[PDB]
Amino acid sequence: VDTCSLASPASVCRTKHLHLRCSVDFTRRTLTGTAALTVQSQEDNLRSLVLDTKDLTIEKVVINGQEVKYALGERQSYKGSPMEISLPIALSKNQEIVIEISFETSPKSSALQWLTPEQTSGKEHPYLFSQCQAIHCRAILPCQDTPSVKLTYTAEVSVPKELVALMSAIRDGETPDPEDPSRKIYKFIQKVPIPCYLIALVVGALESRQIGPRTLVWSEKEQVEKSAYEFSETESMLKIAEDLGGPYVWGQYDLLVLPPSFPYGGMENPCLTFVTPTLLAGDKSLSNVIAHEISHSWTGNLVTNKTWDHFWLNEGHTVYLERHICGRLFGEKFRHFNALGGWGELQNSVKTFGETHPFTKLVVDLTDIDPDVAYSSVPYEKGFALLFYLEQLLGGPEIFLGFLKAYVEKFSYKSITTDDWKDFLYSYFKDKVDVLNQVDWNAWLYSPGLPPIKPNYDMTLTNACIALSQRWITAKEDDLNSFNATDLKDLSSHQLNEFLAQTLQRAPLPLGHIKRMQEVYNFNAINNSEIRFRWLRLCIQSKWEDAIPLALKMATEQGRMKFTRPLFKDLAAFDKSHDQAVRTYQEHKASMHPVTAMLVGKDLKVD
Ligand SMILES: OCc1ccc(Oc2ccccc2)cc1
Ligand SMILES: [Yb+3]
Ligand SMILES: [Yb+3]
Ligand SMILES: [Zn+2]
């Protein structure tokens, strides 16, 4: 039972394949076309089925060349409207049929962002991108919008000729549109079965550069060179990930660097990972996001969560694999540094929601909860903390990686629950079940707050961050003279970020301390998005009026939610910037990503 979907469940019928034929209309901000679903009945005498939709216009439904009866139910808030289709002939178990639905999206589709030329790097062409995770595929096309159903797809997309279309699939050629010479048709094939949240589309003035044997980086012309350099470790990461998870089955591993309003750090769209341009630090320092997206090719894309309640399975295992990739590239001390940083992020999330909040539970109950509202670091970090604890309890990384590879092999091409994972963990570790029975399963999986046990972490790389943060916190006015640019000489960008993270946990600091920090460290000159974000949060919470225009600029010039949401909230919580934060949101709302616009509105209590 998937409480987020209104469609017929996997026990009734299963979509086996999607053949999508569509045209992108920038003037109307609509995607129009036909979604032909190959549906397999899982029941005897199947006469009707239900599909998920959200703000879709249905023109007709065709089965066996004839139009059939359908009905759109009343809208159920964020879930959309159910679409019941009357089948012309009763289906027996395992019988397949093709249902072709003629549809049109709404300009307000929660899955899409339509950008004007002014909102792009080039300023001459418009741009479109999708973001289906968790339940936005229903806002693009009628489907069984649940990760419990996996399907292959083929697609032909008609776009203005001067533009390029890309999808979460293998490129299968381009031709002039035979129905319109002002347009091109781009063809795509996804031969590996995927849950529909992994369906993705981008249309814009895109250019590409090869950066590895199976990797192209894609972006507007202005970002190509910087992107090629920033993501040059991609191939070495794919090789490490293949060694940890088994064969890479997707063919290509391309990267697309989206415009700044992209709401997430990355999206593991198969064959084409989507990334935020906020990763473009110039020194490859934010490459762990690539390692994370690469890891999803095994944990999430091959082994998938059956429902959104089990999202931690996707995230926890991915962060675990991501930290191993970074550990192989940079050393075990670095994997422990990243792991310890993750615990810090988990403390922050638990503190933000409250220790008894249901969204701090590992396995969540999303009945009547919009998944976008529940989204946080909890499934990533609590999920990671559990696996890291288990690794330590079971004999170390080598032993635990053996389980991870067996888990990926066991559940490849399947959709699983926490119980399925737990059953396999007990099966694999049958000779260590006594150790496994010491785990407080009920607390780890179903209780809110911080985990019952904190793993053991090497402190080697964290010590200097803690030591510097503590000097600043315990400093009195007469100790401020002792700080100098030399304090940072031996700190990496990651350590500088951790120093800021540690200090932010104790924010506010006295205004005089923050002014001294700028005077000696010149944190205002740092363009690294993670460091700049933490520094500006530190300034705003410490009530520095000079930081107000810098924080407003960062909150609006980019739209990665990790940054935009807390910056708007910090600005709204500071009396001096409250009105500006609200008015800036109101002015930008219409041109923001629809999900980001909704969430910032809720955060700022602006309806
Ligand atoms: O485990 C908490 C939780 C959080 C979010 C969630 O759904 C998502 C997933 C990705 C993107 C947006 C929403 C499902 C579960
Ligand atoms: Yb081909
Ligand atoms: Yb003193
Ligand atoms: Zn992820």
- Of 2, 311, 377, 565, best ligand 1 pocket probe by most atoms within 8 Å of the beta carbon: 311
Tokens for 99, please give them. Answer: 């249902």
Ligand 1 atom at shortest distance from the alpha carbon of 376: 4
* 135 touches 197 (CB < 8 A): yes
- Resolution value (Å, 1 decimal): 2.0
Is residue 128 within 8 A of residue 203, CB to CB? The reply is yes
The closest residue, in CA terms, to atom 9 on ligand 1 is: 134
Indicate if ligand 1 lies below 6 Å from the C-beta of 375. Answer: yes
Q: Is the CB of 312 under 6 A from ligand 1?
A: yes
Rounded to the nearest 10°, the torsion over CA 99, 104, 107, 111 is: 10
Are 185 and 191 contacting, i.e. CB atoms less than 8 angstroms apart?
A: no
SS (H, E, C) 409-423: HHHCCEEECHHHHHH
For residue 508, say if its preceding peptide bond is cis, omega within 30 degrees of 0.
yes
Alpha-carbon distance values, 314 to 271, 301, 322, 371, 464 (Å):
18, 8, 12, 15, 33
Mutation choice for ligand 1 from 366, 368, 375, 377, CB with most ligand atoms inside 8 A: 375
Structure-token pair, residue 219 = 């972006």
How many Å apart are CA 236 and CA 441, to the nearest integer?
Answer: 36
> Does residue 111 have its Cβ closer than 6 Å to ligand 1?
no
- Calpha distance 575→595 (Å, rounded): 27
Place of tokens 């027996």: 92
Q: Strands of 105-205 (E only): list them.
A: 112-115, 127-130, 150-160, 164-167, 170-177, 180-195, 201-204
Angle between the N-to-C axes of helices 493-504 and 332-353, in degrees from 0 to 180, rounded to the nearest 10: 30
Are 536 and 503 within 8 A, CB to CB? no
CA nearest 36: which of 50, 57, 22, 56? 22
Cis amide linkage into residue 111, ω under 30° from 0: no
* C-alpha–C-alpha distance, residues 259 and 267, integer Å: 14
Q: ∠372-373-375 over CA atoms, to 5°?
A: 65
Q: How many helices (H) and strands (E) does the chain have?
A: 19, 22
The Cα 258–Cα 254 span in angstroms is 13
CA 277 – CA 558 distance, rounded (Å): 9
Tell me: is residue 267 an annotated ligand-binding position.
yes
- Alpha-carbon distance of 524 to 147, in angstroms, equals 43
Helix (H) or strand (E) holding 504: helix 493-504
What are the structure tokens assigned to 161, written together?
Answer: 């000729």
Q: 518 Cβ partners below 8 Å, 6+ apart? A: 524
Residues, Cβ < 5 Å to ion ligand 4: 318
Residue pointed to by tokens 């109101």: 586
Distance CA 476, CA 585 (A): 38
Measured between alpha carbons, how far is 170 from 187 in angstroms, rounded to an integer? Answer: 9
- Residue 251 alpha carbon to ligand 2 centre in Å: 13
**300 CB within 6 A, ligand 1:** no
